[PDB]
């Protein structure tokens, strides 16, 4: 009987039924945010960006707000006159403003899946704030959290506007599942794991948000133009999430590098006696997050992924730049093949291999970031370089699900895996050591010993700016 205004650029107030249904959902979102959102944050004033438009020349306001009061809203890319579908059997036909009946349940399931990862990530990350290495980093965490939240609103809008009764019902159930719960877990495995320390947070935003970039880019070409327009704008916001992850780790590497030079050493035990995260341990964290995330792209060879492209529901990454016929009935793609005791390659029909193409696009983007990290050790004259493990290492989805592959690409026995994987994935004692460094640091402009200062602040504010005010 008091209803918050929902900001949007979709003219929500013109469609009273849709406005009332979303208002009916809002209090439940707020209840979920208060219980599963960032712990103890109810009174904090945080310096945050809030979307107020979709102009690529200034679409966000920056100012202090309490997160429970954050102005979540619905923002789609601008509609385009007579926009056409650009791939699949529907190529050249007009885009859709409502979902065709034959595609309803598939498109709904895609949209639900995407929506579910959003509150999941917040649930995984809600305790991080208590051990934040700086007010800068606490603010970045919170910004990622409020945006995760807006991405739930984004999908819930679509479910209500375009999927009828079950759409409403999906929206409620999106707040009823919980990451790691035994009875109602979240949908994807990776979104039921713990994010137990800030090193994992930075790797998750560097690597796992990037799956989000590539899935969202694929949906941004959807023939279902309301979904396309939603996803286009989500990609604009997700770029900052990828920067938090990439620069986080860069900053850890820098610090470790600094201490290697100052102590004149390489010895991990001496480096840990100084409270830095040694580069080989970092490499295991990269191995873990990379491999686990890679599974999210799905089976390398897939009939479903074929139908999603042919039917026009999900494009390829940067579909419009690709120089083929955008239908693919006579196209090929090269994938791996487990060939007895060897890993070989083989060509398969392109339509059947779309999940592998998207995985490969994602690998290339991760490698470009890893190349940028490796400038730091090079700067210092150190030999160490970060690498990506072979794509079959530590997989549970697809052709490698049942075998073991070492980071360097060898098929290995079950016993070689049990005795060697400690060199490749974080051990219990690695995880304990990383955890022992996680002390909160909250005075303006001070940074915990395990991570260097960032290059600049946020929204032209200084590095020492009071980015969270606590009202203790
Ligand atoms: C492409 C996927 C990912 C998977 O497609 P599907 O069709 O479901 O699966 P396939 O194409 O692999 O199916 C091939 C076949 O393999 C079968 N199979 C066997 N075992 C399994 C098994 N154990 N598990 C699964 N499948 C298994 C399967 O049944 C099928 O069998 P048949 O061939 O019929 O015999 C789809 O979910 C999609 O487009 N999602 C939308 C985008 C999305 O995910 N967005 C989230 C991005 S993150 C982000 O936003 C964010 C990040 C950080 C913070 C916040 C946010
Ligand atoms: Cl569904
Ligand atoms: Cl074996
Ligand atoms: Fe997101
Ligand atoms: Fe994100």
Structure notes:
Monomer. The subunit composition of the active BoxA/BoxB protein complex is not known. One of its GO terms (molecular function) is metal ion binding. Its cofactor is Fe cation. Keywords: Aromatic hydrocarbons catabolism, Dioxygenase, Iron, Metal-binding, NADP, Oxidoreductase. This protein has 472 residues and is mainly alpha-helical. The chain has a single domain, classed as Ribonucleotide Reductase, subunit A (Orthogonal Bundle). The protein is 45% helix and 7% strand. Strands 2-1-7 form a 3-stranded antiparallel sheet. A two-stranded antiparallel ribbon has the order 3-4. The structure holds benzoyl coenzyme A, chloride ion (2 copies) and fe (iii) ion (2 copies). One fe (iii) ion binds at residues 144, 148, 209, 212, 238, 241.
**Annotation, overall tally of beta strands:** 7
- Percent of residues in β-strands: 5-15%
- The 3D shape can be described as globular
CATH fold-level assignment: Ribonucleotide Reductase, subunit A
Q: What's the gist of this structure?
A:
Helix content is about 45%, strand content about 5%. By secondary structure, the protein is mainly alpha-helical. It has one domain: Ribonucleotide Reductase, subunit A.
Key attributes of the depicted protein:
binds benzoyl coenzyme A; 472 residues; mainly alpha; binds chloride ion; 7 strands
């Amino acid at each position: 009987n008091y209803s918050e205004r929902i900001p949007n650029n979709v003219n929500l107030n013109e469609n009273k039924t849709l406005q009332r249904a979303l208002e009916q959902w809002q209090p439940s979102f707020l209840n979920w945010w208060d219980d599963m959102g960032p712990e103890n944050s109810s009174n904090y004033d945080v310096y945050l960006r809030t979307a107020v438009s979709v102009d690529p020349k200034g679409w966000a306001d920056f100012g202090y707000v309490k997160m429970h009061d954050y102005r979540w809203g619905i923002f789609l890319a601008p509609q385009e006159g007579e926009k056409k579908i650009t791939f699949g059997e529907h190529k050249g036909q007009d885009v859709w403003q409502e979902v065709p009946g034959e595609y309803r349940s598939t498109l709904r399931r895609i949209i639900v899946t995407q929506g579910d990862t959003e509150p999941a990530s917040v649930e995984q990350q809600r305790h991080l704030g208590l051990t934040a290495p700086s007010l800068y980093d606490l603010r970045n965490l919170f910004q990622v959290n409020v945006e995760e939240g807006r991405h739930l609103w984004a999908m819930v809008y679509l479910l209500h506007a375009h999927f009828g009764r079950d759409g409403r019902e999906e929206g409620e159930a999106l707040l009823e599942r919980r990451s790691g719960d035994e009875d109602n877990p979240r949908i994807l495995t990776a979104f039921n794991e713990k994010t137990p320390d800030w090193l994992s947070f930075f790797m998750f935003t560097f690597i796992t948000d990037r799956d989000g970039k590539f899935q969202l880019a694929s949906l941004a070409e959807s023939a279902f133009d309301p979904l396309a327009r939603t996803c286009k704008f989500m990609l604009t916001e997700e770029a900052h999430h990828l920067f938090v992850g990439e620069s986080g780790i860069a900053r850890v590497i820098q610090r470790t590098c600094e201490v290697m030079k100052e102590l004149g050493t390489d010895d991990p035990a001496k480096l840990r006696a100084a409270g830095v995260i040694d580069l080989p341990t970092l490499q295991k964290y990269l191995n873990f997050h990379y491999s686990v995330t890679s599974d999210l792209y799905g089976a390398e060879i897939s009939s479903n992924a074929a139908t999603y492209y042919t039917n026009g529901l999900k494009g390829r990454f940067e579909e419009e730049k690709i120089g083929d016929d955008h239908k693919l009935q006579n196209s090929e793609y090269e994938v791996m093949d487990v060939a007895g005791d060897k890993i070989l390659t083989r060509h398969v029909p392109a339509l059947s291999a779309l999940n592998e193409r998207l995985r490969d696009d994602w690998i290339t983007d991760v490698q470009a970031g890893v190349d940028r990290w490796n400038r730091i050790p090079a700067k210092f004259g150190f030999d160490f370089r970060f690498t990506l493990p072979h794509k079959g290492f530590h997989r549970k989805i697809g052709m490698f699900a049942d075998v073991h592959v070492s980071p360097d690409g060898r098929l290995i026995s079950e016993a070689e895996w049990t005795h060697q994987h400690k060199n490749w994935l974080p051990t219990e004692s690695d995880r304990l050591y990383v955890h022992s460094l996680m002390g909160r640091c909250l005075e303006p402009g001070k940074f915990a010993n395990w991570i260097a200062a960032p290059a600049r602040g946020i929204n032209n504010q200084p590095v020492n700016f009071e980015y969270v005010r606590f009202n203790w």
